[PDB]
Amino acid sequence: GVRTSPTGEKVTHTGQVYDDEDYRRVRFVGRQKEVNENFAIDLIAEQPVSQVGSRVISCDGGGGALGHPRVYINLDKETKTGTCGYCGLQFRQQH
């Protein structure tokens, strides 16, 4: 989900884009601006919320030692889903 600036330049996931009057675009004429089209926010927004039947849950990111440090997430609030600090996966108590 990369939007295009009115100058034709692409906008990164950070939101960086050179202005119309910015001279530094001379570094891009005759060449290309390297941006990544796989945005992490849009890809993590497509992950479904996992329903679990426990008050607290443990997340390690998957793979065991190949993931992030294991953390514990509380799911007492029913209005919002508890999200992992590292992986961004969200869990919900099904009650």
Binding site: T12, T14, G15, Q16, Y18, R27, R31, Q32, E34, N38
Partner: protein, 48 residues
């Protein structure tokens, strides 16, 4: 990889690119941060 293929993911490139240095498709470095200080734009109306 014919007998032991790697695990496929959504973000992995399906088209490999060789060394692009010296080509028009070469990498150009740039800052990836927004502007820090926001200047005060003057009003577009005279004081009269």
């Amino acid at each position: 990889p014919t007998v032991k293929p790697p695990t496929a993911r959504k973000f992995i490139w399906t088209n490999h690119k060789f060394n692009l240095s010296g080509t028009p498709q070469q990498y150009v470095p740039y800052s990836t941060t927004r502007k820090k200080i926001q200047e005060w734009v003057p009003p577009s109306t005279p004081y009269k």
